[PDB]
Amino acid sequence: IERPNVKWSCVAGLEGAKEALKEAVILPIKFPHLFTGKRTPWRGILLFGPPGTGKSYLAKAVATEANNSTFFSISSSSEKLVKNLFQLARENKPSIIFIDEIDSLCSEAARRIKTEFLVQMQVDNDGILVLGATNIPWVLDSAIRRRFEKRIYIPLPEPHARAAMFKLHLGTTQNSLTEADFRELGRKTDGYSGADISIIVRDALMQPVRKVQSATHFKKVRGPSRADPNHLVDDLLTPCSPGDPGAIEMTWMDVPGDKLLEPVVSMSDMLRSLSNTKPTVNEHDLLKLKKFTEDFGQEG
Ligand SMILES: *CCC(=O)Nc1cccc(Nc2nc3c(-c4ccccc4)cccn3n2)c1
């Protein structure tokens, strides 16, 4: 329906999962004549691991890289909607279907309606591949589990990958972090999820705006004009502390919209929000993934 645009370079770490998804998804689409007869792409791939390890984000990256294929990102949030889901799949080949939080399935009447998904997997399906993703792979019943013949564990990020993701979640916003800073944020965040890092920087991003909304004084300052970044101007105002040279008793209401110079995102800012959040994952939840990682292996 709509095409994602995530490049390989943008996803941090996950080098192992990239090589397997290249071997299982991308290389067969670009080179169909290699996968003939005995070898054809697996019917469905299952991504499992701790929450916020990039499983869903990795699904968008693999969808962007085939380009020839089409991306149908259906949510975990009705059999005629999936009958046409596979019907529109087979008309446009090659194609892939990502089902985030596929632990959805597996007490209730909706339980009965869950059978419509397995009809399609085993009809003619060649250019269609189903990406499954979940954080609790064990609750999944055996009928779908035997259907994803390839299962990939997405691990917690490594220090280099966490340092990257602190830089990536910043984007183009004004900050004063050095490359040596990002590396230091990697070491201090051991066991932190990918979602956990995204939580930290959004709070750190909100401290400039909080400083503006709370400042009782502003100081005139030089800087690039908000109309043209190439022309330095002098009438800009930035939050100051009540005693700095040039303090003016005024709040953000008295600052014109085009005269505010935003304060930069510090490193102490990011450390201040790092200290206020702790890793979501626990050691118990991971060894339960260890239980799944060995009981069934790849297709058992
Ligand atoms: C090239 C532009 C771009 O895509 N930047 C960007 C911004 C945020 C994150 C990433 N890559 C990335 N995200 C993750 C996660 C993750 C983050 C947030 C929430 C859930 C998961 C986990 C693991 C790896 N990873 N890379 C790129």
Side-chain angles (χ1 to χ4, degrees), residues 1-6 8-37 39-42 44-75 77-78 82 85 87-92 94-107 109-111 115 118-139 141-148 150-210 212-243 245-271 273-284 286-300:
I1 166 159
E2 261 278 78
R3 187 202 74 149
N5 189 90
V6 175
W8 277 132
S9 48
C10 269
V11 47
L14 266 42
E15 296 86 344
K18 293 180 201 187
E19 295 305 303
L21 289 177
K22 286 169 185 175
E23 191 196 50
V25 176
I26 304 180
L27 279 198
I29 295 176
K30 188 169 196 300
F31 311 116
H33 69 277
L34 176 164
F35 294 90
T36 79
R39 49 149 72 111
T40 55
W42 307 86
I45 303 325
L46 177 63
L47 311 181
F48 63 102
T53 53
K55 292 188 290 287
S56 153
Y57 201 72
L58 192 61
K60 315 223 291 214
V62 59
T64 305
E65 286 286 337
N67 189 274
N68 300 0
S69 72
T70 66
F71 190 22
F72 307 145
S73 180
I74 199 161
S75 93
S77 323
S78 289
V82 173
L85 181 85
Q87 175 183 348
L88 197 167
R90 316 199 301 303
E91 50 163 65
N92 312 355
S95 289
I96 67 104
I97 317 156
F98 175 52
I99 308 184
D100 189 17
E101 218 186 7
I102 207 181
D103 49 356
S104 147
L105 173 51
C106 327
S107 34
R111 213 160 36 121
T115 171
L118 298 70
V119 200
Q120 315 288 342
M121 238 77 89
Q122 213 264 351
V123 74
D124 198 16
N125 328 93
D126 305 73
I128 318 283
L129 180 139
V130 175
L131 273 200
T134 166
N135 322 334
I136 40 174
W138 47 85
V139 307
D141 56 340
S142 150
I144 60 81
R145 186 215 328 276
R146 301 204 42 266
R147 203 74 288 181
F148 292 92
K150 249 274 171 195
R151 304 150 187 163
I152 306 169
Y153 175 83
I154 312 304
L156 302 165
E158 293 183 5
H160 188 21
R162 301 191 297 265
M165 278 159 68
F166 272 108
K167 200 218 76 64
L168 269 59
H169 278 105
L170 282 200
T172 55
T173 80
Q174 299 286 339
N175 69 86
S176 51
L177 315 190
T178 79
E179 287 298 318
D181 294 76
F182 297 109
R183 292 185 262 104
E184 182 187 331
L185 275 79
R187 304 186 305 265
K188 298 187 162 304
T189 71
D190 198 348
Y192 277 72
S193 176
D196 291 341
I197 292 181
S198 168
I199 297 201
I200 298 193
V201 312
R202 289 202 304 265
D203 186 78
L205 282 174
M206 292 300 288
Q207 216 80 26
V209 47
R210 275 194 270 265
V212 177
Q213 189 170 331
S214 73
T216 52
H217 293 91
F218 286 77
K219 64 194 251 175
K220 250 184 165 61
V221 64
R222 275 182 54 95
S225 152
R226 326 282 87 180
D228 194 333
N230 225 293
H231 178 59
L232 292 186
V233 81
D234 303 354
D235 52 4
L236 291 158
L237 294 174
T238 177
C240 72
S241 34
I248 302 171
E249 180 164 333
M250 62 189 301
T251 65
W252 62 268
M253 297 180 179
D254 318 288
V255 177
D258 67 297
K259 302 298 178 187
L260 170 65
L261 180 54
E262 69 285 300
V264 279
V265 173
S266 147
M267 174 91 147
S268 55
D269 282 332
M270 193 94 59
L271 288 193
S273 59
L274 164 59
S275 65
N276 282 12
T277 58
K278 279 307 145 197
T280 36
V281 308
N282 48 321
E283 187 177 348
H284 157 81
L286 205 175
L287 60 64
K288 197 54 63 186
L289 281 159
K290 191 53 154 55
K291 173 165 170 51
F292 185 90
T293 324
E294 54 205 21
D295 284 358
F296 308 93
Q298 268 298 285
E299 41 197 341

